[PDB]
Design a protein around this ligand. Structure first.
Ligand SMILES: Nc1nc2c(ncn2[C@@H]2O[C@H](CO)[C@@H](O)[C@H]2O)c(=O)[nH]1
Ligand SMILES: [Cl-]
Length: 296
């Protein structure tokens, strides 16, 4: 976590875009990587909160450039870019603002049923088109192999928690990982481009038309398991629930729905472990203690 004032934001952008006069600045929203500023009412400028976030911002800028006209929904179009330094791979990025509000579970459920169903179809067509984008020209570094990630997570957890857990407790963590890794269904998928953070906060809605009008926040985008993009929608608390996602799956012509459900169940048990690792790697200490407490 690092912080910006309006004066730094304006100065940073002026250095590189001297001819863009700034009138108004205000915070649009915040994710885990960047703060997003609304400039001149019509632009969103993301500035990274730390080096990791900046690397994700850099990722987002390059992916958006590659897929800019391949999708059936608006996505952010980059119009302004910052520069690298010893600290940030990209100091900021500016794009055209997508008007609209997040499609919260609450909003979605209050829509007429025909609109709920168009939303499901629209989300599926967007995912289908996305997961079909040809990935040849993509940076091979973008590939996230789930088997590799799980193995590396198991060594990170050991190394992080070795002096925190009693032996029997670490042995059970070890068992959990071993069990995950002997199940081939988590690891057999055809890699493609995925949004990888495809949740309701990132789906923008036009409440005059009652239709989805944008997908945002491509900072986690990767070449990986397409099923990631359904499981992130399935949580009942903060997301859409099984019923709605099962309409999406059906429009998508998903062939193996029980496999999607099993990946969701495993991801849900996996969350404590993600909180420890994501906690340390994004320096969110609250998450770390929560997952550690849970593990006991
Ligand atoms: N309404 C709107 N919000 C955005 C846009 N880009 C970023 N944000 C907000 O800022 C947060 C961090 O990117 C997002 O998750 C949204 O809350 C945009 O184009 N339109
Ligand atoms: Cl249909």
């Amino acid at each position: 976590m690092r912080t910006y004032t309006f004066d730094q934001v304006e100065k940073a952008i002026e250095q590189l875009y001297p001819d863009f006069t700034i009138n108004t600045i205000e915070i649009s929203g915040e994710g885990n990587d960047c703060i997003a500023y609304e400039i001149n009412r019509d632009f969103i400028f993301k500035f990274p909160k730390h080096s990791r976030g900046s690397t994700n911002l850099f990722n987002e800028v390059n992916i958006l450039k590659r897929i800019h006209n391949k999708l059936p929904l608006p996505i952010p179009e980059v119009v302004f870019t910052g520069m690298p330094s010893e600290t940030y791979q990209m100091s900021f990025a500016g794009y055209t603002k997508i008007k609209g509000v997040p499609l919260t579970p609450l909003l979605l459920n209050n829509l007429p049923k025909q609109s709920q169903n168009q939303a499901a179809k629209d989300l599926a067509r967007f995912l289908s088109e996305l997961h079909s984008i040809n990935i040849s020209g993509f940076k091979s570094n973008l590939v996230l192999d789930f088997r590799e990630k799980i193995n590396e997570d198991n060594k990170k957890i050991k190394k992080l928690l070795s002096r925190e857990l009693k032996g029997p407790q670490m042995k059970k963590v070890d068992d959990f990982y071993r069990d995950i890794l002997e199940n081939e269904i988590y690891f057999k998928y055809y890699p493609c481009l995925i949004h990888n953070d495809f949740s309701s906060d990132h789906i923008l809605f036009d409440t005059e038309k009652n239709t989805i009008c944008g997908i945002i926040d491509f900072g986690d985008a990767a070449i990986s398991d397409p099923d990631n993009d359904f499981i992130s929608l399935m949580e009942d608390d903060e997301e859409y629930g099984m019923e709605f996602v099962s309409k999406i799956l059906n429009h998508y012509k998903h062939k193996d729905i029980p496999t999607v459900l099993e990946k969701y169940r495993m991801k849900e048990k996996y969350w404590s472990f993600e909180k420890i690792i994501y906690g340390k790697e994004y320096g969110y200490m609250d998450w770390y203690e929560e997952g550690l407490n849970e593990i006991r």
